[PDB]
Amino acid sequence: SSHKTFRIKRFLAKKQKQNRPIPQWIRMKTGNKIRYNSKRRHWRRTKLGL
Amino acid sequence: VRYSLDPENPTKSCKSRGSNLRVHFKNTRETAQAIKGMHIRKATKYLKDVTLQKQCVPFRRYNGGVGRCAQAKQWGWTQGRWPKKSAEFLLHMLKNAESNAELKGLDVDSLVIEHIQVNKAPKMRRRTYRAHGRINPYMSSPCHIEMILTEKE
Amino acid sequence: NEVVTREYTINIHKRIHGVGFKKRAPRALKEIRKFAMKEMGTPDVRIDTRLNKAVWAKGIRNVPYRIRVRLSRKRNEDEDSPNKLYTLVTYVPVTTFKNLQTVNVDE
Amino acid sequence: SMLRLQKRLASSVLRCGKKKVWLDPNETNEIANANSRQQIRKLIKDGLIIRKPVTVHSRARCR
RNA sequence: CGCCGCAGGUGCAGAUCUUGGUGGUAGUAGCAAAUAUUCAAACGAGAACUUUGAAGGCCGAAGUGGAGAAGGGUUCCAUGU
RNA sequence: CUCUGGCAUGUUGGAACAAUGUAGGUAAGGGAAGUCGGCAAGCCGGAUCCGUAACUUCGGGAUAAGGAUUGGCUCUAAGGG
Ligand SMILES: [K+]
Ligand SMILES: [K+]
Ligand SMILES: [K+]
Ligand SMILES: [Mg+2]
Ligand SMILES: [Mg+2]
Ligand SMILES: [Mg+2]
Ligand SMILES: [Mg+2]
Ligand SMILES: [Mg+2]
Ligand SMILES: [Mg+2]
Ligand SMILES: [Mg+2]
Ligand SMILES: [Mg+2]
Ligand SMILES: [Mg+2]
Ligand SMILES: [Mg+2]
Ligand SMILES: [Mg+2]
Ligand SMILES: [Mg+2]
Ligand SMILES: [Mg+2]
Ligand SMILES: [Mg+2]
Ligand SMILES: [Mg+2]
Ligand SMILES: [Mg+2]
Ligand SMILES: [Mg+2]
Ligand SMILES: [Mg+2]
Ligand SMILES: [Mg+2]
Ligand SMILES: [Mg+2]
Ligand SMILES: [Mg+2]
């Protein structure tokens, strides 16, 4: 909602920063074995815990 | 790459190919069987006529529920349709094959489709929602298409 | 000649008879387009917006029985197109349709 | 090309609905260049954007 | 891997068996609740569906309008694909 | 039904107008003979002026039942500050 506590807003802030694509240079690293961010979350498919 | 049925001599032949194409395999297989053995100019008009619904492709194997048409009598058949998307995809591949023929410097007015093949491509998954909280597959059926055109006159 | 313009009257009532209420006006413009392709032999038929108003003047189901149009066959020598000729059909307001023939109209 | 933004901004500047915003169908390119409310105001002054009048609902029959 | 001994989580068609994959059904059922679309133009490789204009309709203020609470959490806004 | 405001017909379109259906109408003559059963549908319906039974806990029954009128136009009276 519009009325939110600081903890809830701070919690939402962290979930927002970590929902980004992996940097491209990562695949160039030796022994990368990572293709894409498997922890991507869309607001409509899956809802946050809180 | 590995084609099935390599040409009798790969000097008067040109090849074209596509993978994971978003056309129905059953419609494309019937359309490929119709243009097989055609001269390249005949196949191009015929595929354009299918788009304009002036000529049909006969549905011989994958014919369940396919309706009847008057144009199916040109073929020794009763059931026929006008797969527009299959016609476009084969038209694009015929243009690519003719361009390859020009690159090898062999004339395009004598090309004949001696080989054409439609293969199943890996299905892609979507979802549909049913009556009592049930999920059912809504699969796509893409196809791999390859063809070989040779000179004869 | 091939840049000829002619003025016709189309019996919309005849060509719409039997069509359902929500489809009479949309079908009237299809028959008008079909009519133009027949007399002018051009697949590309452009319908003037004023003619589109006249067909839709009395709503979607009470299309006018008769309409007086003007078929202008003109060159498409403006861009690379599969058709070098196109027909522009326009609206000709009339007070009566009695004794109206198909007449050749000058420039 | 696409003028969804311009019709929204013209509606806000003119203080009318998007029903009454008239964008010149011939001068689409100039309107497409307007990405600011200031640019919309200049286009309103220049006549390329017009507030259409209210649809007439007469009371003569009632009177 | 053969031979002499040793030791087993040692042999599958079934168990409405477990997991995975694939068929026929089948280009079938179907994409039918709430009246409705049409003309021209633009961009574009490509237009029934995008945008603009024109027309015909609908919601008809107990709205298909304008704003909030709960809930959602960036869905908001530009540009691009 | 319309104005302000909003939208594009509700996750597709085109062509036809077979059966069967779903939703909605009409039907001569008869009028529940249909059916377990008037189910469903149909009849009635607003307002004004009349007029209203048995029974009753005297409150009701009661819009009982039943009947007449209803448009448009031109006036005429009455009702105030
Ligand atoms: K058919
Ligand atoms: K039919
Ligand atoms: K009965
Ligand atoms: Mg949800
Ligand atoms: Mg069947
Ligand atoms: Mg479902
Ligand atoms: Mg559910
Ligand atoms: Mg065992
Ligand atoms: Mg087994
Ligand atoms: Mg079907
Ligand atoms: Mg359907
Ligand atoms: Mg209405
Ligand atoms: Mg609202
Ligand atoms: Mg947005
Ligand atoms: Mg509808
Ligand atoms: Mg629609
Ligand atoms: Mg919806
Ligand atoms: Mg009867
Ligand atoms: Mg009777
Ligand atoms: Mg009986
Ligand atoms: Mg009986
Ligand atoms: Mg009943
Ligand atoms: Mg009684
Ligand atoms: Mg009277």
Coordinates of C-alpha atoms (C1' of nucleotides) and ligand atoms in Angstrom, one line a residue:
Chain A
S1 CA 0.0 0.0 0.0
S2 CA 0.9 3.7 0.1
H3 CA 1.1 3.6 3.9
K4 CA 4.2 1.4 4.6
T5 CA 6.6 1.1 7.5
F6 CA 10.3 1.8 7.1
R7 CA 11.2 -1.9 7.5
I8 CA 8.7 -3.0 4.8
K9 CA 10.0 -0.3 2.5
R10 CA 13.6 -1.2 3.2
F11 CA 12.7 -4.9 2.6
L12 CA 11.1 -4.0 -0.8
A13 CA 14.2 -1.9 -1.7
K14 CA 16.5 -4.9 -1.4
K15 CA 14.2 -7.2 -3.4
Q16 CA 14.2 -4.6 -6.1
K17 CA 17.9 -4.2 -6.5
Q18 CA 18.6 -7.9 -6.7
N19 CA 16.0 -8.4 -9.4
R20 CA 18.3 -7.5 -12.3
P21 CA 19.9 -9.4 -15.1
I22 CA 23.4 -10.9 -14.6
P23 CA 26.2 -8.7 -16.1
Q24 CA 27.4 -9.9 -19.5
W25 CA 31.1 -10.1 -18.5
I26 CA 30.3 -12.9 -16.0
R27 CA 30.1 -15.5 -18.8
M28 CA 33.6 -14.6 -19.9
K29 CA 35.0 -15.5 -16.5
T30 CA 37.0 -18.8 -16.4
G31 CA 34.8 -21.7 -15.2
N32 CA 31.7 -19.5 -15.1
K33 CA 29.0 -22.1 -15.4
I34 CA 26.3 -19.5 -15.0
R35 CA 23.9 -18.7 -17.9
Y36 CA 21.3 -16.4 -16.5
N37 CA 19.8 -15.1 -13.2
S38 CA 17.7 -18.0 -12.1
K39 CA 16.3 -16.0 -9.1
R40 CA 14.6 -13.4 -11.3
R41 CA 11.2 -12.5 -9.9
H42 CA 8.2 -10.9 -11.7
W43 CA 5.7 -9.0 -9.6
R44 CA 2.8 -10.7 -11.3
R45 CA 3.9 -14.4 -11.4
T46 CA 5.3 -14.9 -7.9
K47 CA 4.5 -12.7 -4.9
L48 CA 6.9 -11.8 -2.2
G49 CA 6.9 -13.6 1.1
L50 CA 5.5 -10.7 3.2
Chain B
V1 CA 25.5 -29.8 -42.5
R2 CA 24.1 -33.3 -42.8
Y3 CA 21.1 -33.5 -45.1
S4 CA 19.2 -36.7 -45.7
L5 CA 19.4 -37.7 -49.4
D6 CA 22.5 -36.0 -50.6
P7 CA 22.2 -34.9 -54.3
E8 CA 23.3 -37.3 -57.0
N9 CA 26.0 -34.7 -57.8
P10 CA 26.5 -31.5 -55.7
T11 CA 27.5 -29.4 -58.6
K12 CA 24.1 -28.9 -60.3
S13 CA 22.3 -28.8 -56.9
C14 CA 21.5 -26.1 -54.2
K15 CA 20.4 -26.6 -50.7
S16 CA 18.2 -24.7 -48.2
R17 CA 17.3 -25.4 -44.6
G18 CA 15.4 -24.0 -41.6
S19 CA 15.2 -25.1 -38.0
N20 CA 12.6 -24.5 -35.3
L21 CA 10.2 -22.7 -37.6
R22 CA 6.9 -21.6 -36.1
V23 CA 4.6 -23.4 -38.5
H24 CA 2.4 -26.4 -37.8
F25 CA 4.2 -29.6 -38.8
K26 CA 1.1 -31.3 -40.2
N27 CA 0.2 -28.4 -42.5
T28 CA 3.8 -28.0 -43.6
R29 CA 4.2 -31.7 -44.3
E30 CA 1.2 -31.7 -46.6
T31 CA 2.3 -28.5 -48.4
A32 CA 5.8 -29.9 -48.9
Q33 CA 4.4 -33.1 -50.5
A34 CA 2.4 -31.0 -53.0
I35 CA 5.4 -29.0 -54.3
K36 CA 7.8 -32.0 -54.3
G37 CA 9.0 -32.6 -57.8
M38 CA 7.8 -29.3 -59.1
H39 CA 9.7 -26.9 -61.2
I40 CA 10.8 -23.9 -59.1
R41 CA 8.7 -21.5 -61.2
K42 CA 5.7 -23.8 -60.9
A43 CA 6.2 -24.2 -57.2
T44 CA 6.4 -20.4 -56.7
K45 CA 3.1 -19.7 -58.4
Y46 CA 1.5 -22.7 -56.8
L47 CA 2.5 -21.5 -53.3
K48 CA 1.2 -18.0 -54.1
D49 CA -2.1 -19.5 -55.3
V50 CA -2.5 -21.3 -52.0
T51 CA -2.1 -18.0 -50.3
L52 CA -4.8 -16.5 -52.6
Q53 CA -6.9 -19.7 -52.2
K54 CA -6.9 -20.3 -56.0
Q55 CA -5.1 -23.7 -55.6
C56 CA -5.2 -26.0 -52.6
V57 CA -2.8 -28.5 -51.0
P58 CA -4.4 -32.0 -50.6
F59 CA -4.4 -33.2 -47.0
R60 CA -3.7 -36.9 -47.4
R61 CA -2.2 -38.2 -44.2
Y62 CA -3.0 -35.6 -41.6
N63 CA -6.6 -35.3 -42.8
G64 CA -8.7 -35.8 -39.7
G65 CA -11.6 -33.3 -39.8
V66 CA -10.2 -31.5 -42.8
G67 CA -13.1 -30.3 -45.0
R68 CA -13.7 -30.9 -48.7
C69 CA -13.0 -28.5 -51.5
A70 CA -13.6 -28.3 -55.2
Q71 CA -9.9 -27.6 -55.9
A72 CA -8.9 -30.9 -54.3
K73 CA -9.9 -32.6 -57.6
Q74 CA -6.8 -31.4 -59.4
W75 CA -5.1 -33.9 -57.1
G76 CA -6.6 -37.3 -57.0
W77 CA -8.1 -36.4 -53.6
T78 CA -11.2 -35.0 -51.9
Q79 CA -9.8 -33.1 -48.8
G80 CA -7.8 -29.9 -49.2
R81 CA -7.0 -26.7 -47.4
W82 CA -5.0 -23.5 -47.9
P83 CA -2.3 -23.3 -45.3
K84 CA -1.2 -19.7 -45.6
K85 CA 1.6 -19.7 -43.0
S86 CA 3.0 -22.9 -44.4
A87 CA 3.0 -21.4 -47.9
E88 CA 4.9 -18.3 -46.8
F89 CA 7.6 -20.3 -44.9
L90 CA 8.2 -22.5 -48.0
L91 CA 8.2 -19.4 -50.2
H92 CA 10.9 -17.9 -48.0
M93 CA 12.9 -21.1 -48.2
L94 CA 12.5 -21.3 -52.0
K95 CA 13.9 -17.7 -52.3
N96 CA 16.8 -18.7 -50.1
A97 CA 17.5 -21.8 -52.2
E98 CA 17.3 -19.8 -55.4
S99 CA 19.8 -17.2 -54.0
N100 CA 22.1 -20.1 -53.1
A101 CA 21.7 -21.4 -56.7
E102 CA 22.8 -18.0 -58.0
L103 CA 25.8 -18.0 -55.7
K104 CA 27.0 -21.3 -57.2
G105 CA 26.4 -19.9 -60.7
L106 CA 23.9 -22.5 -61.8
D107 CA 20.8 -21.2 -63.7
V108 CA 17.6 -20.9 -61.7
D109 CA 15.2 -21.4 -64.6
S110 CA 15.8 -25.2 -64.6
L111 CA 15.7 -25.9 -60.9
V112 CA 13.4 -28.7 -59.7
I113 CA 12.6 -29.6 -56.1
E114 CA 14.0 -33.2 -56.0
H115 CA 14.1 -33.4 -52.2
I116 CA 12.1 -31.7 -49.5
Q117 CA 11.5 -33.0 -46.0
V118 CA 9.7 -31.7 -42.9
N119 CA 10.8 -32.9 -39.5
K120 CA 9.4 -32.5 -36.0
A121 CA 11.1 -29.7 -34.0
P122 CA 11.3 -29.6 -30.2
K123 CA 7.8 -28.6 -28.9
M124 CA 7.5 -25.4 -26.9
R125 CA 5.3 -25.2 -23.8
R126 CA 2.4 -22.9 -23.0
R127 CA -0.5 -23.3 -20.6
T128 CA -4.3 -23.5 -20.8
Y129 CA -6.8 -23.4 -17.9
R130 CA -9.6 -25.9 -17.6
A131 CA -12.8 -26.4 -15.7
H132 CA -11.9 -27.6 -12.2
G133 CA -8.6 -25.9 -11.4
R134 CA -6.7 -28.0 -13.9
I135 CA -3.8 -27.0 -16.1
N136 CA -3.4 -28.6 -19.5
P137 CA -0.5 -28.3 -22.1
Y138 CA -0.9 -26.0 -25.0
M139 CA 2.1 -27.2 -27.0
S140 CA 3.4 -25.8 -30.2
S141 CA 4.6 -28.1 -33.1
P142 CA 7.4 -26.3 -34.9
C143 CA 9.3 -28.1 -37.7
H144 CA 12.7 -28.4 -39.4
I145 CA 12.5 -28.1 -43.2
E146 CA 15.2 -28.9 -45.7
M147 CA 15.2 -29.1 -49.5
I148 CA 17.5 -29.7 -52.4
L149 CA 17.0 -28.2 -55.9
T150 CA 18.6 -29.7 -59.0
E151 CA 18.9 -28.6 -62.6
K152 CA 17.0 -30.6 -65.2
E153 CA 15.4 -29.7 -68.5
Chain C
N1 CA -8.7 5.3 -72.5
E2 CA -7.6 4.1 -69.0
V3 CA -7.9 7.3 -67.0
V4 CA -11.6 7.3 -67.5
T5 CA -14.1 8.5 -64.8
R6 CA -17.7 7.4 -64.7
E7 CA -20.7 8.0 -62.5
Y8 CA -22.9 5.1 -61.4
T9 CA -25.8 4.5 -59.1
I10 CA -25.6 1.4 -57.0
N11 CA -28.6 -0.5 -55.7
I12 CA -27.4 -1.0 -52.1
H13 CA -30.8 -2.4 -51.2
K14 CA -30.4 -5.2 -53.7
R15 CA -26.9 -6.1 -52.5
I16 CA -27.6 -5.9 -48.8
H17 CA -30.9 -7.8 -48.7
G18 CA -30.8 -10.5 -46.1
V19 CA -27.8 -9.3 -44.2
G20 CA -28.2 -9.0 -40.4
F21 CA -28.7 -5.7 -38.6
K22 CA -25.1 -5.3 -37.2
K23 CA -23.6 -6.1 -40.6
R24 CA -25.6 -4.1 -43.2
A25 CA -23.4 -1.0 -43.3
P26 CA -20.1 -2.9 -43.2
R27 CA -21.3 -5.2 -45.9
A28 CA -22.6 -2.2 -48.0
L29 CA -19.0 -0.9 -48.3
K30 CA -17.8 -4.4 -49.3
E31 CA -20.4 -4.5 -52.0
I32 CA -19.4 -1.0 -53.1
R33 CA -15.8 -2.1 -53.2
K34 CA -16.8 -5.2 -55.1
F35 CA -18.8 -3.1 -57.5
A36 CA -15.9 -0.9 -58.3
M37 CA -13.5 -3.8 -59.0
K38 CA -16.0 -5.2 -61.4
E39 CA -16.7 -2.1 -63.6
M40 CA -13.2 -0.6 -63.4
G41 CA -11.2 -3.9 -63.3
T42 CA -8.9 -2.6 -60.6
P43 CA -8.2 -4.6 -57.4
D44 CA -7.1 -1.5 -55.6
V45 CA -10.2 0.5 -54.8
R46 CA -10.1 3.5 -52.4
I47 CA -13.4 4.6 -50.9
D48 CA -13.6 8.3 -50.1
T49 CA -14.4 9.2 -46.5
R50 CA -17.4 11.2 -47.6
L51 CA -18.8 8.2 -49.3
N52 CA -18.1 6.2 -46.1
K53 CA -20.2 8.9 -44.2
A54 CA -23.1 8.6 -46.7
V55 CA -23.3 4.8 -46.3
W56 CA -23.2 5.2 -42.5
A57 CA -25.4 8.3 -42.5
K58 CA -28.5 6.5 -41.2
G59 CA -26.7 4.2 -38.7
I60 CA -25.6 0.6 -39.1
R61 CA -28.8 -1.2 -40.2
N62 CA -30.8 1.4 -42.1
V63 CA -28.4 1.9 -45.1
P64 CA -29.7 4.0 -48.0
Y65 CA -31.4 1.9 -50.7
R66 CA -29.5 3.6 -53.5
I67 CA -26.3 5.6 -53.6
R68 CA -24.8 7.7 -56.5
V69 CA -21.1 7.1 -56.8
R70 CA -18.4 8.2 -59.2
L71 CA -15.7 5.8 -60.2
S72 CA -12.4 7.4 -61.1
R73 CA -9.7 5.0 -62.5
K74 CA -6.4 6.8 -62.0
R75 CA -2.7 5.9 -62.4
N76 CA -0.8 4.6 -59.4
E77 CA 2.5 6.0 -60.9
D78 CA 3.5 7.3 -57.6
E79 CA 5.4 4.4 -56.0
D80 CA 6.4 0.8 -56.6
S81 CA 3.1 -1.1 -56.3
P82 CA 1.9 -4.4 -57.8
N83 CA -1.0 -2.4 -59.4
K84 CA -0.3 0.5 -61.8
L85 CA -4.0 1.5 -61.7
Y86 CA -6.4 2.2 -58.8
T87 CA -10.1 3.3 -58.6
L88 CA -11.2 6.1 -56.3
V89 CA -14.9 6.0 -55.6
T90 CA -16.5 9.3 -54.4
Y91 CA -19.9 10.4 -53.2
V92 CA -22.3 12.2 -55.5
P93 CA -25.3 13.8 -53.6
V94 CA -28.5 13.6 -55.6
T95 CA -32.1 14.6 -54.9
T96 CA -33.7 11.8 -56.8
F97 CA -32.6 8.5 -58.5
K98 CA -35.3 8.5 -61.1
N99 CA -34.1 8.2 -64.7
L100 CA -30.5 8.3 -63.7
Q101 CA -28.2 6.5 -66.2
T102 CA -24.6 5.5 -66.1
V103 CA -22.9 8.6 -67.6
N104 CA -19.4 9.3 -68.7
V105 CA -18.1 12.3 -66.8
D106 CA -15.4 14.6 -68.3
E107 CA -12.4 16.0 -66.5
Chain D
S1 CA 4.2 7.7 -35.8
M2 CA 2.7 7.3 -32.4
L3 CA 1.0 10.1 -30.5
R4 CA -0.4 8.5 -27.3
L5 CA 1.9 10.7 -25.2
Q6 CA 1.0 13.9 -27.0
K7 CA -2.8 13.4 -26.7
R8 CA -2.4 12.8 -23.0
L9 CA -0.3 15.9 -22.5
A10 CA -2.6 18.1 -24.7
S11 CA -5.5 16.9 -22.6
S12 CA -3.8 17.9 -19.4
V13 CA -2.6 21.3 -20.7
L14 CA -6.0 22.1 -22.3
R15 CA -7.8 20.9 -19.1
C16 CA -10.2 18.8 -21.2
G17 CA -10.6 15.1 -21.9
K18 CA -8.9 13.2 -24.6
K19 CA -12.2 13.3 -26.5
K20 CA -11.8 17.0 -27.2
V21 CA -8.1 16.9 -28.2
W22 CA -7.6 17.4 -31.9
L23 CA -4.2 16.6 -33.3
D24 CA -3.6 17.7 -36.9
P25 CA -3.6 14.5 -39.0
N26 CA -1.3 16.1 -41.6
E27 CA 1.3 17.5 -39.2
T28 CA 2.0 14.3 -37.4
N29 CA 5.8 14.7 -37.5
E30 CA 5.8 18.0 -35.8
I31 CA 3.5 16.8 -33.0
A32 CA 5.6 13.7 -32.6
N33 CA 8.6 15.9 -31.9
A34 CA 6.7 17.5 -29.0
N35 CA 7.7 15.6 -25.8
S36 CA 7.1 18.4 -23.2
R37 CA 4.1 20.4 -22.0
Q38 CA 5.9 23.5 -23.1
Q39 CA 6.1 22.2 -26.7
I40 CA 2.5 21.2 -26.5
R41 CA 1.6 24.7 -25.5
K42 CA 3.5 26.1 -28.5
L43 CA 1.6 23.7 -30.7
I44 CA -1.7 24.8 -29.2
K45 CA -0.8 28.4 -29.9
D46 CA 0.3 27.5 -33.5
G47 CA -3.1 25.8 -34.2
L48 CA -1.7 22.3 -34.6
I49 CA -3.6 21.2 -31.5
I50 CA -7.2 22.3 -31.0
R51 CA -9.8 21.8 -28.3
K52 CA -12.9 20.5 -30.0
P53 CA -16.2 22.1 -28.9
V54 CA -18.6 20.4 -26.6
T55 CA -21.1 18.0 -28.3
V56 CA -24.4 19.9 -28.6
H57 CA -27.1 18.8 -26.1
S58 CA -29.8 21.4 -26.8
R59 CA -32.7 22.0 -24.3
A60 CA -34.9 23.7 -26.9
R61 CA -37.1 20.6 -27.1
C62 CA -37.5 20.5 -23.3
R63 CA -38.2 24.3 -23.1
Chain E
rC1 C1' 38.0 -59.1 -20.9
rG2 C1' 39.1 -64.8 -20.4
rC3 C1' 40.2 -68.7 -16.5
rC4 C1' 40.6 -70.5 -10.8
rG5 C1' 38.4 -68.8 -6.3
rC6 C1' 35.6 -65.0 -3.3
rA7 C1' 31.2 -61.5 -2.4
rG8 C1' 26.5 -59.4 -3.6
rG9 C1' 21.9 -53.7 -3.4
rU10 C1' 22.9 -59.7 -9.4
rG11 C1' 18.5 -61.0 -14.4
rC12 C1' 11.4 -57.8 -15.1
rA13 C1' 6.0 -57.2 -18.9
rG14 C1' 2.9 -56.6 -15.5
rA15 C1' 2.3 -54.4 -9.0
rU16 C1' -4.8 -48.5 -11.0
rC17 C1' 4.1 -49.9 -9.7
rU18 C1' 8.3 -45.1 -9.4
rU19 C1' 10.7 -41.3 -12.5
rG20 C1' 11.4 -39.5 -17.4
rG21 C1' 10.1 -39.4 -22.4
rU22 C1' 6.6 -40.3 -26.7
rG23 C1' 2.1 -41.6 -29.5
rG24 C1' -3.3 -42.4 -31.5
rU25 C1' -7.1 -39.4 -30.2
rA26 C1' -6.2 -34.6 -33.7
rG27 C1' -4.9 -30.1 -37.0
rU28 C1' -9.9 -32.6 -33.4
rA29 C1' -12.8 -30.3 -29.1
rG30 C1' -12.5 -25.6 -29.1
rC31 C1' -10.6 -19.8 -29.3
rA32 C1' -19.8 -18.1 -29.0
rA33 C1' -21.8 -14.2 -21.4
rA34 C1' -22.2 -8.3 -21.2
rU35 C1' -25.6 -4.7 -29.2
rA36 C1' -20.4 -2.6 -33.3
rU37 C1' -17.9 -1.5 -36.2
rU38 C1' -16.4 1.4 -41.0
rC39 C1' -13.3 4.8 -44.3
rA40 C1' -8.7 7.4 -45.2
rA41 C1' -3.7 8.4 -43.9
rA42 C1' 1.1 7.8 -41.2
rC43 C1' 5.1 4.8 -39.4
rG44 C1' 6.6 0.1 -40.8
rA45 C1' 9.7 -5.6 -44.4
rG46 C1' 4.9 -6.7 -42.7
rA47 C1' -1.5 -3.6 -40.3
rA48 C1' -8.7 -6.7 -39.0
rC49 C1' -6.0 -5.4 -34.0
rU50 C1' -0.7 0.4 -33.4
rU51 C1' -1.3 6.0 -34.0
rU52 C1' -4.0 10.3 -36.1
rG53 C1' -8.4 12.2 -38.5
rA54 C1' -13.4 11.3 -40.0
rA55 C1' -18.1 8.6 -39.1
rG56 C1' -21.5 5.1 -36.5
rG57 C1' -22.3 3.1 -31.6
rC58 C1' -21.9 1.8 -26.2
rC59 C1' -21.0 2.9 -20.6
rG60 C1' -25.4 7.0 -19.3
rA61 C1' -23.3 10.3 -12.9
rA62 C1' -26.1 3.5 -8.3
rG63 C1' -20.7 4.9 -15.1
rU64 C1' -17.0 1.2 -18.8
rG65 C1' -16.2 8.6 -15.3
rG66 C1' -12.9 11.1 -11.3
rA67 C1' -10.1 9.8 -6.5
rG68 C1' -9.0 6.8 -1.9
rA69 C1' -8.5 2.4 2.2
rA70 C1' -6.7 -3.0 2.3
rG71 C1' -3.5 -5.7 -0.7
rG72 C1' 0.4 -5.6 -4.6
rG73 C1' 5.7 -3.5 -4.8
rU74 C1' 8.0 -0.4 -9.2
rU75 C1' 3.5 -2.8 -12.2
rC76 C1' 4.5 4.5 -12.3
rC77 C1' 7.3 7.7 -16.5
rA78 C1' 10.5 8.2 -21.0
rU79 C1' 13.5 5.7 -24.8
rG80 C1' 14.6 1.2 -27.2
rU81 C1' 13.8 -4.2 -28.5
Chain F
rC1 C1' -32.3 8.3 -24.4
rU2 C1' -28.5 12.1 -24.0
rC3 C1' -24.0 16.0 -22.2
rU4 C1' -18.9 16.0 -19.3
rG5 C1' -15.5 12.0 -18.9
rG6 C1' -14.3 7.0 -20.9
rC7 C1' -14.1 2.7 -24.2
rA8 C1' -13.5 -0.6 -28.5
rU9 C1' -17.5 -5.2 -27.5
rG10 C1' -14.3 -8.2 -23.4
rU11 C1' -7.9 -13.9 -25.0
rU12 C1' -9.2 -14.0 -32.7
rG13 C1' -11.2 -12.7 -37.6
rG14 C1' -13.5 -14.0 -42.8
rA15 C1' -17.4 -16.5 -45.6
rA16 C1' -22.2 -18.9 -45.3
rC17 C1' -27.3 -19.2 -42.9
rA18 C1' -27.9 -27.2 -42.9
rA19 C1' -29.5 -30.4 -38.8
rU20 C1' -29.3 -30.3 -33.3
rG21 C1' -28.9 -26.7 -29.7
rU22 C1' -28.7 -22.0 -26.4
rA23 C1' -31.4 -17.2 -25.9
rG24 C1' -35.8 -14.5 -27.8
rG25 C1' -40.7 -13.9 -30.5
rU26 C1' -45.3 -15.1 -33.2
rA27 C1' -49.1 -18.7 -34.3
rA28 C1' -55.7 -20.0 -37.2
rG29 C1' -59.6 -23.2 -34.3
rG30 C1' -59.8 -25.4 -29.5
rG31 C1' -58.2 -24.0 -24.3
rA32 C1' -54.6 -28.0 -19.7
rA33 C1' -57.6 -32.7 -23.6
rG34 C1' -50.4 -32.2 -22.1
rU35 C1' -48.0 -33.5 -17.3
rC36 C1' -46.7 -36.8 -11.3
rG37 C1' -48.1 -31.9 -10.9
rG38 C1' -50.3 -25.6 -15.2
rC39 C1' -43.5 -27.1 -14.9
rA40 C1' -42.7 -23.3 -18.5
rA41 C1' -45.1 -19.6 -20.8
rG42 C1' -49.2 -16.6 -21.0
rC43 C1' -53.0 -13.2 -18.5
rC44 C1' -53.0 -8.8 -15.0
rG45 C1' -50.2 -4.5 -14.1
rG46 C1' -49.3 2.8 -13.6
rA47 C1' -52.7 6.8 -12.3
rU48 C1' -57.9 9.0 -11.6
rC49 C1' -63.2 8.1 -10.5
rC50 C1' -66.4 4.7 -8.5
rG51 C1' -67.1 0.0 -5.8
rU52 C1' -65.6 -3.8 -2.5
rA53 C1' -67.7 -10.0 0.4
rA54 C1' -67.1 -14.0 3.9
rC55 C1' -64.4 -14.0 8.1
rU56 C1' -61.8 -11.4 12.1
rU57 C1' -57.6 -11.2 17.6
rC58 C1' -62.0 -5.4 15.1
rG59 C1' -56.2 -3.8 14.0
rG60 C1' -57.2 -6.4 9.2
rG61 C1' -59.0 -8.9 4.9
rA62 C1' -58.2 -4.7 0.9
rU63 C1' -54.8 -2.9 -4.8
rA64 C1' -60.5 -7.9 -2.0
rA65 C1' -63.5 -9.0 -6.1
rG66 C1' -65.8 -5.9 -10.2
rG67 C1' -66.4 -1.4 -13.6
rA68 C1' -65.2 3.2 -16.3
rU69 C1' -61.5 6.7 -18.1
rU70 C1' -56.4 7.7 -20.0
rG71 C1' -53.8 10.7 -26.7
rG72 C1' -53.3 15.5 -29.3
rC73 C1' -54.9 20.5 -29.7
rU74 C1' -57.6 25.2 -28.3
rC75 C1' -59.4 27.2 -24.1
rU76 C1' -62.1 28.3 -19.3
rA77 C1' -62.1 28.5 -13.8
rA78 C1' -59.7 27.8 -8.9
rG79 C1' -55.7 27.5 -5.8
rG80 C1' -50.3 33.2 -4.3
rG81 C1' -46.5 37.1 -3.2
Ligands
K1 K -14.0 -26.2 -47.8
K2 K -22.4 -22.9 -44.0
K3 K -54.2 -30.6 -16.6
MG4 MG -2.7 -12.1 -8.2
MG5 MG -12.9 -36.7 -36.2
MG6 MG -10.4 -22.8 -19.8
MG7 MG -9.2 -21.6 -10.1
MG8 MG 17.3 -55.9 -6.1
MG9 MG 9.8 -52.5 -17.5
MG10 MG -12.9 -26.6 -35.0
MG11 MG -16.1 -21.0 -31.4
MG12 MG -26.9 4.9 -24.2
MG13 MG -13.2 4.7 -11.0
MG14 MG 3.0 2.2 -18.5
MG15 MG -20.8 -9.1 -29.6
MG16 MG -13.2 -7.5 -31.1
MG17 MG -10.5 -9.5 -19.9
MG18 MG -53.0 -20.3 -31.0
MG19 MG -57.1 -18.2 -30.6
MG20 MG -55.1 -34.5 -17.4
MG21 MG -52.8 -38.1 -20.0
MG22 MG -44.4 -20.2 -13.1
MG23 MG -59.5 -12.6 -0.6
MG24 MG -59.6 14.5 -24.7

